[PDB]
Amino acid sequence: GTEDLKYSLERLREILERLEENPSEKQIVEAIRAIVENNAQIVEAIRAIVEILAQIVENNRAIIEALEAIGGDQILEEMKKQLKDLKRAL
Amino acid sequence: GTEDLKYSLERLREILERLEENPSEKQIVEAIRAIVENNAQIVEAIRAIVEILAQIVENNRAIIEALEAIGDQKILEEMKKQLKDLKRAL
Amino acid sequence: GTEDLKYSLERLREILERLEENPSEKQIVEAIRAIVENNAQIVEAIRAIVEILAQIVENNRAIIEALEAIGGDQKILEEMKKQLKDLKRAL
């Protein structure tokens, strides 16, 4: 979600600059509230990346199965082992 | 920029200690500005990750094409679909 | 640490709510500390992702090797191990 993030950060430097110009307890708190919103979109993006990473790994296994189908070097064992490791990591 | 991040975070843990030692409106504001810098570093790292996830998907497609050339088609259809879906997410 | 994030963020939205109900210099500093802790978790999760992205590139590399073993088109395999080399550098 790069687009949403960059707008979330652009909003931050502004809220920051506004805070820096006229510091206030309320201005500080509003600045913190904005930061928690930015981290919420960072987390949502990170969570999305992992979902895509798992989708990639699911695709690789289908490729290795397709390579084993047409007589790939039983090399295929080590690679599918990588996938098992990757699947566990995620 | 994993290394750059690690340095960015530890700079933050320091300011947090400095802040907590002598809390001050100016020290709090400095701590907030540093967090934005960290968030900007995190956002820049994420954008880099998504650019790489796209490069992989491009490679998976290229790999599948090569697989289809040397002969099966149903699996090849299933794989290419997952690839298109992944390009959709990005 | 996808799950830990989800939990580290909820703690933050709460400390934020408490801070908004009662604002105070101590409550502010405690909120900043939680954010550093949250950023520390976000960083640990990113570093994990990149380690995984490196693991994928070594698998694709191993696949393209297997494609060549059984006679994949050298031209295609050339551009494919190329994008593989570029990826390794980007990491």
Author numbering:
A (entry chain C): 3 to 76, 78 to 93
B (entry chain B): 3 to 73, 75 to 93
C (entry chain A): 3 to 93
Manuscript excerpt for this entry:
We used de novo protein design to generate very closely related proteins that adopt two very different states—a short state and a long state, like a viral fusion protein—and then created a single molecule that can be found in both forms. We decided on a design scheme with two divergent conformations containing a constant six-helix bundle “base” and a variable portion with three inner helices and three “flipping” helices. In the compact “short” state (∼66 Å height), the flipping helices fold back to interact with the inner helices; in the extended “long” state (∼100 Å height), they extend to form interactions with each other.
The interaction energy between the flipping helix and the inner helices in the short state was tuned by combining hydrogen bond layers (“A”) or hydrophobic layers (“X”) in different orders in each of three possible positions. Designs were given three-letter names corresponding to the layers in order, starting at the hinge proximal position. We sought to design calcium- or nickel-binding sites in the long state by introducing aspartic acid or histidine at the key hinge residue position. We also designed for structural ambiguity in the turn—with the result that the secondary structure prediction for residue 75 is mixed helical and coil, but with low confidence. Crystal structures were determined for all potential bistable candidates (XAX_GGDQ, XXA_GVDQ, XAA_GGHN, and XAA_GVDQ), and we chose to focus on XAA_GVDQ because of the presence of a bound calcium.
